[PDB]
């Protein structure tokens, strides 16, 4: 066939769609105990039972989590048992072979999905595509149980069958480059804001201030973030898994940690410092000094280290379950599981503090502002704008994860990981928004058309 | 796009007394810092003598004990009280109004400058 480029018609990726793959025992939108690729246990309501018949079609103790080689043996076997019950059945064979390969495999779909009795059950719309009258059938299927069950698959398989085309799946592989665009953006927007302000700050002598001392730090967390974690982010989302081993997952994953611990608190040391530089203005120029400032970013990536190397690599942060286990074990896995302690007291120190002091602190700013030695202008306006641009960014950037990341270790799968992941990337392009808020002085300005010449 | 009006300065005999003047005319931030600088002759401009919008002052060591700055009610209106004037003290005065309106940073708006002669 000479066909190895992205996307195959076959009913393989169209049940990965329909399905997608989890590895540990969930339920459906009926309520059967389902696994890996929409792999019906049981339909006992007890999960004892269902880890039974897990471990007897596994052929070992799984304790309700299976690896994904084990996963796809599964997929394939119940897909040919579809096949097998297609053939066996005297009512879907002469449909299934008076069948173009596409409606085919959305008939191989449906028994995989309703098994091979239950689609046997369709006596008119089986007849309808026998006699190819795929509109007919397209309108009958949407009148059954089926449909109204799960509806957004069953218009998938309905438009397979009347279209007879992959229009309702080709679709779908475009999100991925469409979205993996979008995080080469991301990397190259962060990478050169931050090289950018560091190179700004490093060349130019007019820019050497505490704040910008913070500057420096805040954008170096920035460039890490930009250079190590996002990138190899984007690779494991897109490759959909891990070629680098656990030694540089776990250590991969401890440099996002100490990056974005570090960014959150510099962004705090910084809100701090303007605190001090506004309202007493004497005082902090005369004490905190450049030498002192260096002492505080050493604290603070202290700090960074000790919430990220320091749990990680001495495995502290890794969960107990079997999932976890299996994942720590798989050298192809890296995907983020840990316990409540590590959870609360990482999202503790890396945002919730910082957001405490941040809001008290320009709120003590707005609030003084308001008692000082004197009509309702418009320097006031603008001010209140710019600090809400300041806090605005960084809330909107970075709470819904740590909202996120603290509710997902208390009650059980009640955030998918898609959403997790969404959010910590919304989380991850604050590094990118960062030189955009903290570098608009005029020297900042002047030193950033002077770098590149415009 | 404010205006900075300074008044007061001149010439004056050695051990005299002056008083220079400086009104803001515009929209200021509530948190400013209202000084004076100025630029000996041959030397970098030095600070004289800067006050707070919270009341607070801060002066150079060449003229603490001798200058004293003040500031209006809310006029944003800053006079430099000027005592025991000295040849050193020969210098050209800017007023000064640092603006905390970006938070992050603080925009400068200066003045025409006065000339100050101190009868050696």
């Known amino acids: 066939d000479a066909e190895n480029l992205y996307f195959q018609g076959n009913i393989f990726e169209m049940l990965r769609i329909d399905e997608g793959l989890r590895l540990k025992i969930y339920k459906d939108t009926e309520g059967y105990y389902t696994i890996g690729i929409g792999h019906l246990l049981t339909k006992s309501p007890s999960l004892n039972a269902a880890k039974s018949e897990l471990d007897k079609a596994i052929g070992r103790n799984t304790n309700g989590v299976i690896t994904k080689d084990e996963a796809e043996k599964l997929f394939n076997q119940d897909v040919d048992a579809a096949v097998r019950g297609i053939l066996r059945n005297a009512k879907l064979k002469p449909v299934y072979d008076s069948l173009d390969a596409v409606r085919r495999a959305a008939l191989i779909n449906m028994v995989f999905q309703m098994g091979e009795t239950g689609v046997a059950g369709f006596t008119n719309s089986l007849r309808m595509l026998q006699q190819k009258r795929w509109d007919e059938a397209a309108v009958n299927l949407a009148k059954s149980r089926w449909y109204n069950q799960t509806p957004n698959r069953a218009k998938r398989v309905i438009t397979t069958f009347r279209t007879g085309t992959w229009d309702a799946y080709a679709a779908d592989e475009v999100w991925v480059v469409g979205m993996g665009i979008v995080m080469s953006l991301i990397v190259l927007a962060i990478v050169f804001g931050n090289v950018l302000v560091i190179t700004a700050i490093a060349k130019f002598e007019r820019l050497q201030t505490v704040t910008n001392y913070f500057i420096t730090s805040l954008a170096c967390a920035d460039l890490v973030m930009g250079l190590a974690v996002v990138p190899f982010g984007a690779a494991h989302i897109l490759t959909k898994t891990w070629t680098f081993g656990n030694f540089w997952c776990e250590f991969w994953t401890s440099i996002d940690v100490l990056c974005v611990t570090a960014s959150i608190e510099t962004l705090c040391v910084i809100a701090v410092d303007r605190y001090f530089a506004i309202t007493s203005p004497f005082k902090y120029q005369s004490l905190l000094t450049k030498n002192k400032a260096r002492v505080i970013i050493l604290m603070v990536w202290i700090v960074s280290g000790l919430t990220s190397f320091l749990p990680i690599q001495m495995h502290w942060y890794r969960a107990t379950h079997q999932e976890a286990i299996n994942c720590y074990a798989e050298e192809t896995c890296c995907d983020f599981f840990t316990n409540q302690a590590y959870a609360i007291a990482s999202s503790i120190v890396s945002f919730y503090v910082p957001l405490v002091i941040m809001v008290f602190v320009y709120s003590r700013v707005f609030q003084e502002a308001k008692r000082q030695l004197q009509k309702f202008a418009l320097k006031e306006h603008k001010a209140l704008k710019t600090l809400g641009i300041i806090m605005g960014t960084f809330t909107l950037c970075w709470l819904p994860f740590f909202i996120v990341n603290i509710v997902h270790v208390i009650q059980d799968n009640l955030i998918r990981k898609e959403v997790y992941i969404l959010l910590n990337w919304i989380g991850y392009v604050n590094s990118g928004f960062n030189p955009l808020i903290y570098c608009r002085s005029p020297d900042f300005r002047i030193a950033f058309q002077e770098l590149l010449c415009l | 796009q404010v205006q900075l009006q300074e008044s007061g300065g001149g010439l004056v005999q050695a051990g005299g007394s002056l008083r220079l003047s400086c009104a803001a005319s515009?929209?200021?931030?509530?948190?400013?810092?209202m000084g004076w600088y100025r630029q000996a002759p041959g030397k970098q401009r030095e600070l004289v003598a800067a006050?707070?919008?919270?009341?607070?002052?801060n002066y150079a060591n060449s003229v603490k004990g001798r200058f004293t700055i003040s500031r209006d009610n809310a006029a944003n209106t800053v006079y430099l009280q000027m005592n025991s004037l000295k040849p050193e003290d020969t210098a050209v005065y800017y007023c000064?109004?640092?603006?905390?309106?970006?938070?992050?940073?603080?925009?400068?708006?200066w003045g025409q400058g006065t000339q100050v002669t101190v009868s050696s």
């Open positions: 515009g929209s200021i931030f509530a948190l400013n810092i």
């Open positions: 006050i707070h919008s919270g009341g607070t002052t």
């Open positions: 000064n109004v640092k603006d905390f309106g970006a938070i992050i940073y603080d925009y400068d708006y």
